[PDB]
Amino acid sequence: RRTARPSGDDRELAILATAENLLEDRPLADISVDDLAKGAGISRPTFYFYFPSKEAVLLTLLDRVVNQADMALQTLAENPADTDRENMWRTGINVFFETFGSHKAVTRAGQAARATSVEVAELWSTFMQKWIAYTAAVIDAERDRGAAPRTLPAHELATALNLMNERTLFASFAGEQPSVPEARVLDTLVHIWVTSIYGE
Amino acid sequence: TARPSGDDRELAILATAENLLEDRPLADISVDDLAKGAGISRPTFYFYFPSKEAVLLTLLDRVVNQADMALQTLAENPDRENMWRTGINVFFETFGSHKAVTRAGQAARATSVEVAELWSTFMQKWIAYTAAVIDAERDRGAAPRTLPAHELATALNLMNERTLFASFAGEQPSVPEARVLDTLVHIWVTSIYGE
Ligand SMILES: O=C(C1CCN(c2nnc(-n3cccc3)s2)CC1)N1CCC(Cc2ccccc2)CC1
């Protein structure tokens, strides 16, 4: 037996979408459970049949965005096209440009929660480690086929490149200064990846 | 020379703070700990600093300026790969010799507008410097004209900010600290001279 809950799942989804909307204008501290309940069309007691706190709502939101990026990247890893090397790295990076770039408010809220929440910190750290291991393995496969030279240890080169994308894409999304303009940040990272993976 | 301009108590306050941030964040440091390290009563502290946050901002002002003037010294008295290595190694060595203040300064960026503006100001200045050197290396024909120089400069300087911090904080993921400078030099040099 499997317990399908179309109605409970749909309302959970409306709470999550309500939170994501509110985060575009206000930090999580300025959002109340009543704002969440009212956005989701339920009473405030009813909210607690779906989440225990507004922090659990944000943790679920970050779960959703991080796993959407992870799954999109894994989808690329299992369906390799007949394409050039620059396009390979560009579509991989664009997974993160497009996923987090379409969820800017949740991304900003997650970064801010990284210092106060161990779950968020360990969530982000877990997925960075996996994406770095994946990058390292693609770098090594490019070395094995003779397409990239054996320079730095793959995992170290992978770590610095993925940390660059983290800092740089966030600076673009959050409109920080300094930042690369959002319309130019993909080309910028792709160039640095491709030159440093294939050059000596 | 590099001596803090105040008397011995101002030095003692700053060094006690820097020492204690080695194992505790600033919230776990009291004004009393700072005053005790300088040998003064608690109210006497406020003849030197208005708050313990002011002490951390002054310590980070010293680190950031020590970095900027070691780099401006490089600019006055000059192979391409080693030029970038010595410039990156200014930050590896400066912030690597103040890991406690660097890590406390990073945490204070979220809560202090002075700290965030301080960091953003010198990052802009350091990125402009990188961008000018890239432009001079293109005008003499040594580097290809690929990305806009200021945009390539920004990502590499943000790379270093986030990668050196991860090494110095022992984060996972991070590059081991004995290997971080070669890693960043290689990426800087391939991306600045590659087509
Ligand atoms: O991590 C990122 C993005 C994510 C979005 N960003 C964030 N900034 N703060 C955030 N935060 C804090 C708490 C919650 C979220 S997320 C900026 C960058 N990466 C990994 C590196 C790279 C991955 C890759 C691997 C293999 C092949 C191609 C590409 C592509 C980009």
Residue numbers in the entry:
A (entry chain B): 15 to 214
B (entry chain A): 17 to 94, 98 to 214
Please give sentences taken from the publication describing this entry.
Studies of the resistance mechanism of ethionamide revealed that an increase in the expression of HTH-Transcriptional regulator, EthR, reduces transcription and the level of active EthA protein, and results in resistance by M. tuberculosis. The discovery of this transcriptional regulator led to the notion of controlling EthA expression levels by targeting EthR and thus boosting the bactericidal effect of ethionamide.
We then managed to obtain X-ray crystal structures for compounds 1, 2, 3, 5, 6, 7, 10, and 12 bound to EthR.
